[PDB]
Amino acid sequence: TRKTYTLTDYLKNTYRLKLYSLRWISDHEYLYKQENNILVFNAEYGNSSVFLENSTFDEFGHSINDYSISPDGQFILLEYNYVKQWRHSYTASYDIYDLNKRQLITEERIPNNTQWVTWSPVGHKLAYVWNNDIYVKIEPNLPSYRITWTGKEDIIYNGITDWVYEEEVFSAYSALWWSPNGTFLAYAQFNDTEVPLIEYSFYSDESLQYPKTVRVPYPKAGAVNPTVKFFVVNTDSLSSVTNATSIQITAPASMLIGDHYLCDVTWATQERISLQWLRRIQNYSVMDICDYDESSGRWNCLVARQHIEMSTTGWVGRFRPSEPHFTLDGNSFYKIISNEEGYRHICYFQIDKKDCTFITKGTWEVIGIEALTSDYLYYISNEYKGMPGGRNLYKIQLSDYTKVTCLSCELNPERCQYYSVSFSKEAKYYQLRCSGPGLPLYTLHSSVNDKGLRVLEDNSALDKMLQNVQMPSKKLDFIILNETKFWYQMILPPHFDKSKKYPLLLDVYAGPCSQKADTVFRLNWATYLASTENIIVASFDGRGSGYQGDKIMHAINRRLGTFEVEDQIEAARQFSKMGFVDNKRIAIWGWSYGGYVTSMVLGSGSGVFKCGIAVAPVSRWEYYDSVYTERYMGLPTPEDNLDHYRNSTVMSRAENFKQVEYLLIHGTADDNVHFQQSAQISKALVDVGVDFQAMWYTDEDHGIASSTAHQHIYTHMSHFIKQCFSLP
Amino acid sequence: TRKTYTLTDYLKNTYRLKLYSLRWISDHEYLYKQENNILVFNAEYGNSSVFLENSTFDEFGHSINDYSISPDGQFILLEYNYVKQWRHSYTASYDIYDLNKRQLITEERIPNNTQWVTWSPVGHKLAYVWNNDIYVKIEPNLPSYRITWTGKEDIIYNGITDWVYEEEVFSAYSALWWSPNGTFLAYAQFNDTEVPLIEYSFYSDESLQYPKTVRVPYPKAGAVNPTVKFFVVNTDSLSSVTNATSIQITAPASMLIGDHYLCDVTWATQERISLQWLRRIQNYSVMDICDYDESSGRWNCLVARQHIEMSTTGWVGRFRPSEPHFTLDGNSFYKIISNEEGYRHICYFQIDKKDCTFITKGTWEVIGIEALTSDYLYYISNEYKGMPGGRNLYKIQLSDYTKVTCLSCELNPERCQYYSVSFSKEAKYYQLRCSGPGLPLYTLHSSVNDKGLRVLEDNSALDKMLQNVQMPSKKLDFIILNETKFWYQMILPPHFDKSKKYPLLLDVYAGPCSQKADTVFRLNWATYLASTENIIVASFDGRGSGYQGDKIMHAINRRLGTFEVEDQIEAARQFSKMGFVDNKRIAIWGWSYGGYVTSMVLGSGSGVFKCGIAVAPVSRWEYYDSVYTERYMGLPTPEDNLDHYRNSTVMSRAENFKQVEYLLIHGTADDNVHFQQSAQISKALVDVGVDFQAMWYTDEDHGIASSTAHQHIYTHMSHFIKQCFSLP
Numbered sequence A, B: 001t002r003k004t005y006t007l008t009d010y011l012k013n014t015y016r017l018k019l020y021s022l023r024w025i026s027d028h029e030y031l032y033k034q035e036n037n038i039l040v041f042n043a044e045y046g047n048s049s050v051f052l053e054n055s056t057f058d059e060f061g062h063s064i065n066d067y068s069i070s071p072d073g074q075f076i077l078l079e080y081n082y083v084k085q086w087r088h089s090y091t092a093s094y095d096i097y098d099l100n101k102r103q104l105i106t107e108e109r110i111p112n113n114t115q116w117v118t119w120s121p122v123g124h125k126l127a128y129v130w131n132n133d134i135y136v137k138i139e140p141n142l143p144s145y146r147i148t149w150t151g152k153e154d155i156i157y158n159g160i161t162d163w164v165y166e167e168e169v170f171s172a173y174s175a176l177w178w179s180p181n182g183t184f185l186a187y188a189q190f191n192d193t194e195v196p197l198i199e200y201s202f203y204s205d206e207s208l209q210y211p212k213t214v215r216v217p218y219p220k221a222g223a224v225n226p227t228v229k230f231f232v233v234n235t236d237s238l239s240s241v242t243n244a245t246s247i248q249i250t251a252p253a254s255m256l257i258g259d260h261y262l263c264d265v266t267w268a269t270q271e272r273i274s275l276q277w278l279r280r281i282q283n284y285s286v287m288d289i290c291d292y293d294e295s296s297g298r299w300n301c302l303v304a305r306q307h308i309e310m311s312t313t314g315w316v317g318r319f320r321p322s323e324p325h326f327t328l329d330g331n332s333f334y335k336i337i338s339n340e341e342g343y344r345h346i347c348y349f350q351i352d353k354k355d356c357t358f359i360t361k362g363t364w365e366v367i368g369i370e371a372l373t374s375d376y377l378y379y380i381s382n383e384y385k386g387m388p389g390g391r392n393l394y395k396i397q398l399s400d401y402t403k404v405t406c407l408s409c410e411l412n413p414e415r416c417q418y419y420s421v422s423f424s425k426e427a428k429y430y431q432l433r434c435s436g437p438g439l440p441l442y443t444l445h446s447s448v449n450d451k452g453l454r455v456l457e458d459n460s461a462l463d464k465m466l467q468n469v470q471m472p473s474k475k476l477d478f479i480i481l482n483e484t485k486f487w488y489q490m491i492l493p494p495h496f497d498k499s500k501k502y503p504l505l506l507d508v509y510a511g512p513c514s515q516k517a518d519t520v521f522r523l524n525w526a527t528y529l530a531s532t533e534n535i536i537v538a539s540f541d542g543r544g545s546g547y548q549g550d551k552i553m554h555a556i557n558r559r560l561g562t563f564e565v566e567d568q569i570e571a572a573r574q575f576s577k578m579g580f581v582d583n584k585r586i587a588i589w590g591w592s593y594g595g596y597v598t599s600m601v602l603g604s605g606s607g608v609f610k611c612g613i614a615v616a617p618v619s620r621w622e623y624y625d626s627v628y629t630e631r632y633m634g635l636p637t638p639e640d641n642l643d644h645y646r647n648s649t650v651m652s653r654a655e656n657f658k659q660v661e662y663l664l665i666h667g668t669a670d671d672n673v674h675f676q677q678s679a680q681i682s683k684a685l686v687d688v689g690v691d692f693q694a695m696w697y698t699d700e701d702h703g704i705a706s707s708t709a710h711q712h713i714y715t716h717m718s719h720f721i722k723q724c725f726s727l728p
């Protein structure tokens, strides 16, 4: 009786998870799409109205992929012809619709194949990138002003990031930043002239007779990196001059001496901007704070306002130096930095004083600063119950740091331990997003008195369905190794019986500053494996994992492929010693960094695992990109860390794979972890006479997320796992 | 008790067939390499002498890949630094050693990276190609004369073939032809300027940070083909002060009207050369016979000497128009052509006469003309016992065509039914090479009275080893289909018992004019499957197969992927009805064209096959090269045969694979059948949700022949077949 969570359930998404995505358009109103039409909600009372009826664009002749209302509510940007590129980048067509006179603007329209478009933060100015050059339109129906003329495909990028900056630094395609009231438009320019190209075939539809060769500037570890420059243009002067001047802001001398990166851009006030630069050896960063000089029309960054951030134990920041949050007057800012103990906490800075004051502290960390008002700073941390895998919203009194209120901890402690938040424009209201351990719960709250206004989405519908299925349970706990505690989670089959021996699958990622043991509720492949196949799926956060202090996170500095790999093997030993695991049936699998660790574990000769699956794995660090790799590994040169680069490859352990069953999978169009990486693993295995299973996914990328391939790969992996555990 | 022939025996070659490869140097002597030393043998008595010491180059410094003694015996070309290119092409370095003065020539030596080299047919002149240009050396130690100056990598080829001409037309890298006494040097010139390039990644050794992109001019079906020109140059009148003059021989107007190919070059006399041209629509070819004009210095090809060869049912020739065999005075010639019954026989032509006289006839075919004297013409045919899969040497009296004598049929009928032959210079002697059904047997014979002089190699050593192994047997027979007989062979497990049910694997190629059912003795994968796994391995020759007349061969004209696929299913259906076949365990596998047919069969929905394996298969004809594809399919244009091109793909049958187990294999560096072909197959399977097994071989080409890859692919396929058949 009562069905279980099956593979088909997962692949067909029969049990749908509901969410509540809103867009604040002011300090007390937000937009919500309720069945193809845009509604506007009054936060205060919960009442609404139709902002844009679903029939507004039926004869548009195109499927609108997304929309964007200008800050002043006067226009709406319609995106269509969406064509995905990398992780964040894509191109599209755009039309502007005048919401007042209800008409679609047909003159001086945004070009087709536009790479990026953004409204000014105030009013309705527009800035967009086309053919790698920046353009600005003061009015939707007027001609654009071209800002740059150097744009050149795969070579010069104005206003948009190149491959590595998009993926590893800004996690965005856009590289432009409007000043608060929209007067200035700041942007970065990347030059990839000497950056080597990764080349791979793209087969496309069957009708393409000759395969296409995709070529993208991609700097592998130790190769020539793109160089970068920063500029600011006064958009208010565009209609007064024929060719507005882009004033350059040069990097400090400490960065110019060698290769470096621009890693953060954050406006402070209408005439003050801050920039952080990072040396290619990512343990030294500098923040400049630059002011507009109204008499010279130039930007100057006083050395008395420069802030240095460096690390003696690792790289700076979790993945990059943190962003500052300036007070209204721009004279001070809050920033998350690692304290003397190695834990990331909020530090209060005066712009012209080098010593900051920490406003939080403890053996836990601040995840992020969410909002700042004249009286309070709101942040998310894992302080609650000392659970590094939990997240809660807190409020600290700027006039009395001992006054810290946890705003989400006790709301529903059993159902909610992992929160995310979304504040209105002036932080007058905030939407809380609970994502576990129970079903996601979305709520709205008033900042003036921190009172709950109402439940936005409680997922009652799904709760109703799941009651008729034997769902698995999840356990989150820790084990103590060398005096330090390390967390793990287990997806346990229904009616779990600890007096039995269950087969165990270790689900691993384990890249630096990652966390696989948390309180988030997920419906994924492990759900089906535990529920239907009675398999225990475990994950462990060992050395190198984040949110637990630098002692743990920086333990793998300059040594990827060691401690995080070993700790995974040790975790499996610990789990077997728990008594309910069948030592004859322990498997391991991972994707991406997880594919690498899995492969390293399978080739360790530990004898602990019977089989494993690596999906799109890194196989040798010299094949991965510079920014990410070098951050942890330094440079692959004899004078630096070449020996470890050469000693941490999967290929060097090929012989040991004779002891296990291995399934290797990779998408041929992977622009991130090149197919090359798995090509070298398979070749090494063939060379030592090792048999193994393999699967390539034609034209799929690092995500192997196309609908058909997603279903195909998880189906293939399920058969392999079931076979290895002989269920069947 | 007696081991079996195992997979390791196949992979490690424990049981080696001995050969006897001799090189005729005159009408009565030949060279044979024994114990690394080159000996010269007197054919008449069998006595020998050492020709060159295996130690002469003891300290040569390089590993000699091969040697080539000049016609006059005065010099020996040493080949080293061999680097393989495609199926026949490669580059290497060469040295010339003087046998008389026992000295290595050190002045004016052949360049490194030479693409082709060849002695003149007489004496010791040399002609070689380097950087795509032709050079001639009258003396080994003198400077060479540059014959061509237009050589350009991947664009202009002088004296060497481009990819398609190498693979599909000449089956050689060489595109130069010396006149009989070495006076003239004829050569072709290929222009691939507008030929599209196939591009694919080459990963190389682990140390290569960025994969390289290989690109080769390769015309896929319907694409722009390379153009060709033919030249003749007098090597007796070269000057070191003036650039050699090449005389062009243009193709006939019936050829110049559209795309065409040069398909054969054969010298008739010291001053007469014959050339055959073929239209891109390969059912029309023309032979020109050209004579040197001593007063003009030009070459004239009289129209009265033109010979047209066309086909109304298919293409011309087996794979191309056959080569002519001219008489001593070059006034007449013998050439194999399809007769009015559609059977290939020898026709006797007068150079200035249109009608030729057939000298052989019957429901069987001449395989090739092997030697010609004033009294007899020697040839190989499958006439004996009406077995299309057998081959014997015959001679026919030119003065009375009714006098035909079989020279090998009765030598040893039980052990020998498949012969190839090698005649000395003036056909005074001939070496017979029996290759089946028993162990290979090499013998020497004298033509005057067809005496069997002696046994050169009888493989008695191998015979002694095989008596201690349980070897499989081979059954060759036929089934009837619509009053027509089609042959098949079965490799039967040792101690075959017709009262038992054996699983069966259909080994298929089935390309046009192929033959898989024959009397040849082979030690291969099938030998192991039958001997050790007790699997019957069968092969069948259906419509489209060769050596049985055009009625059968041309049955698939303009329709590949139809009758040849259906006939394999029909054969399996019949075998499944036999008492000794387990109809629950019938599999099919093939490589290359056999990979295509295997895939087409598995996606047929016939229900006869449980599983199958396709290695480097063609999946849609538009992806394969023009010369081979168009020969059978015409052009992929709506006005020609595009519909069938689109209806004969593997991809369109994806859905029907849900009922079978399929293993798809392909080398990533396949320059012949591009990985693309399998990449589209897998994508189609993923798109309809059908699970399957796959394996790519990094950097392997169409042969997947490197030692490690070879062992790995056959090990992997063995596991697949055994699992499919439930064999321990």
Ligand SMILES: *[C@@H]1O[C@H](CO)[C@@H](O[C@@H]2O[C@H](CO)[C@@H](O)[C@H](O)[C@H]2NC(C)=O)[C@H](O)[C@H]1NC(C)=O
Pocket (backbone or CB within 6 Å): A040, A041, A042, A045, A047, A048, A049
């Ligand atoms: C939500 O409902 C309120 C209450 O009816 C609307 O409030 C408006 O408030 C102004 C000033 O207080 C009044 O003068 C208006 O008369 C009210 N609106 C109307 C239509 O009478 C508010 O407009 C509603 N908001 C949404 C998004 O529907």
Ligand SMILES: *[C@@H]1O[C@H](CO)[C@@H](O[C@@H]2O[C@H](CO)[C@@H](O)[C@H](O)[C@H]2NC(C)=O)[C@H](O)[C@H]1NC(C)=O
Pocket (backbone or CB within 6 Å): A150, A156, A191, A192, A193, A194
């Ligand atoms: C991008 O960087 C390249 C250098 O990598 C710059 O190109 C050089 O430009 C100078 C002067 O124009 C030439 O003398 C050099 O020959 C160029 N070097 C190379 C390798 O091309 C280029 O100017 C930069 N582009 C921009 C817009 O800054």
Ligand SMILES: *[C@@H]1O[C@H](CO)[C@@H](O[C@@H]2O[C@H](CO)[C@@H](O)[C@H](O)[C@H]2NC(C)=O)[C@H](O)[C@H]1NC(C)=O
Pocket (backbone or CB within 6 Å): A149, A150, A243
């Ligand atoms: C606007 O100003 C920029 C910068 O002065 C101009 O860009 C220069 O263009 C010239 C050739 O026209 C080049 O020699 C320079 O190298 C360019 N400099 C930069 C920074 O790009 C641009 O051409 C001007 N646009 C117009 C319409 O005049």
Ligand SMILES: *[C@@H]1O[C@H](CO)[C@@H](O[C@@H]2O[C@H](CO)[C@@H](O)[C@H](O)[C@H]2NC(C)=O)[C@H](O)[C@H]1NC(C)=O
Pocket (backbone or CB within 6 Å): A181, A182, A183, A234, A236, A270, A271, A292, A294
């Ligand atoms: C946005 O901020 C800019 C910069 O402070 C404002 O522009 C300045 O306005 C003052 C007047 O208060 C002028 O004296 C300066 O010449 C302006 N400077 C520049 C660089 O333009 C601008 O007015 C603000 N925009 C809005 C809408 O308030």
Ligand SMILES: *[C@@H]1O[C@H](CO)[C@@H](O[C@@H]2O[C@H](CO)[C@@H](O)[C@H](O)[C@H]2NC(C)=O)[C@H](O)[C@H]1NC(C)=O
Pocket (backbone or CB within 6 Å): B181, B182, B183, B236, B270, B271, B292, B294
């Ligand atoms: C190869 O054949 C050619 C052509 O038949 C011979 O060249 C001719 O030789 C005679 C002398 O006996 C000359 O008078 C002709 O002018 C030559 N013809 C040409 C085209 O050169 C040549 O002698 C023969 N070579 C050998 C080694 O026998």
Ligand SMILES: *[C@@H]1O[C@H](CO)[C@@H](O[C@@H]2O[C@H](CO)[C@@H](O)[C@H](O)[C@H]2NC(C)=O)[C@H](O)[C@H]1NC(C)=O
Pocket (backbone or CB within 6 Å): B281, B283, B284, B310, B311, B312, B313, B634, B639, B640, B641
């Ligand atoms: C050689 O083959 C071609 C193609 O099959 C024949 O040419 C014509 O082909 C088109 C279709 O491509 C048909 O519509 C015509 O009926 C075919 N015949 C003719 C005369 O056009 C061509 O006839 C063949 N040549 C010979 C000598 O058999």
Ligand SMILES: *[C@@H]1O[C@H](CO)[C@@H](O[C@H]2O[C@H](CO)[C@@H](O)[C@H](O)[C@H]2NC(C)=O)[C@H](O)[C@H]1NC(C)=O
Pocket (backbone or CB within 6 Å): B040, B041, B042, B045, B047, B048, B049
């Ligand atoms: C094979 O044997 C013959 C003798 O039967 C050898 O001798 C003949 O050839 C020699 C040159 O090759 C001559 O010098 C002899 O005069 C000649 N003898 C006769 C009776 O004809 C011959 O050389 C031997 N061949 C080899 C390759 O060793």
Ligand SMILES: *[C@@H]1O[C@H](CO)[C@@H](O[C@H]2O[C@H](CO)[C@@H](O)[C@H](O)[C@H]2NC(C)=O)[C@H](O)[C@H]1NC(C)=O
Pocket (backbone or CB within 6 Å): B150, B156, B191, B192, B193, B194
């Ligand atoms: C090789 O073929 C090319 C192209 O067929 C010849 O060049 C011709 O084609 C060019 C376009 O690719 C035209 O722009 C040229 O006008 C045309 N003729 C010349 C002289 O370029 C090229 O000459 C051929 N090369 C040889 C050695 O025959």
Ligand SMILES: *[C@H]1O[C@H](CO)[C@@H](O[C@@H]2O[C@H](CO)[C@@H](O)[C@H](O)[C@H]2NC(C)=O)[C@H](O)[C@H]1NC(C)=O
Pocket (backbone or CB within 6 Å): B109, B110, B111, B112
């Ligand atoms: C072809 O290349 C080879 C390899 O460079 C040349 O051989 C010489 O090899 C020695 C070592 O064995 C080197 O020290 C020399 O530098 C090489 N070159 C020379 C000129 O000595 C060879 O000379 C080249 N030959 C031709 C015809 O190109």
Ligand SMILES: C[C@@H]1C(=O)NCCCN1C(=O)C[C@H](N)Cc1cc(F)c(F)cc1F
Pocket (backbone or CB within 6 Å): A167, A168, A169, A171, A319, A511, A592, A593, A617, A618, A628, A672, A673, A702
């Ligand atoms: C999560 C992390 C982040 O928060 N900020 C910066 C960039 C986004 N982030 C990343 O880790 C990106 C990395 N390229 C992800 C990553 C790591 C790895 F080892 C691979 F093989 C492939 C891959 F895609």
Ligand SMILES: C[C@@H]1C(=O)NCCCN1C(=O)C[C@H](N)Cc1cc(F)c(F)cc1F
Pocket (backbone or CB within 6 Å): B167, B168, B169, B171, B319, B511, B592, B593, B617, B618, B628, B672, B673, B702
């Ligand atoms: C045997 C045949 C011949 O005798 N003469 C001419 C060329 C050599 N010959 C060929 O068939 C060559 C073809 N490219 C072989 C061939 C056919 C096919 F369908 C493939 F997918 C791949 C392949 F390599």
Ligand SMILES: *[C@@H]1O[C@H](CO)[C@@H](O)[C@H](O)[C@H]1NC(C)=O
Pocket (backbone or CB within 6 Å): A035, A036, A037, A053, A054, A055
């Ligand atoms: C909005 O459009 C949807 C179609 O997605 C339709 O079902 C619904 O009835 C519409 N609702 C309103 C209020 O127009």
Ligand SMILES: *[C@@H]1O[C@H](CO)[C@@H](O)[C@H](O)[C@H]1NC(C)=O
Pocket (backbone or CB within 6 Å): A093, A109, A110, A111, A112
């Ligand atoms: C975009 O492309 C379409 C079709 O190519 C064209 O009709 C339209 O006018 C283009 N719009 C712009 C702004 O270029």
Ligand SMILES: *[C@@H]1O[C@H](CO)[C@@H](O)[C@H](O)[C@H]1NC(C)=O
Pocket (backbone or CB within 6 Å): A281, A283, A284, A310, A311, A312, A313, A634
């Ligand atoms: C930064 O890293 C390099 C490489 O390990 C190191 O030599 C240098 O001392 C580091 N700088 C600091 C401040 O730790």
Ligand SMILES: *[C@@H]1O[C@H](CO)[C@@H](O)[C@H](O)[C@H]1NC(C)=O
Pocket (backbone or CB within 6 Å): B149, B241, B242, B243
């Ligand atoms: C031979 O022809 C080439 C090609 O044009 C030319 O460069 C060279 O100088 C010529 N040599 C003589 C001696 O005419």
Ligand SMILES: *[C@@H]1O[C@H](CO)[C@@H](O)[C@H](O)[C@H]1NC(C)=O
Pocket (backbone or CB within 6 Å): B481, B482, B484
């Ligand atoms: C004869 O047999 C062939 C196959 O051998 C089949 O395709 C055909 O339909 C049959 N009938 C005739 C009249 O050819």
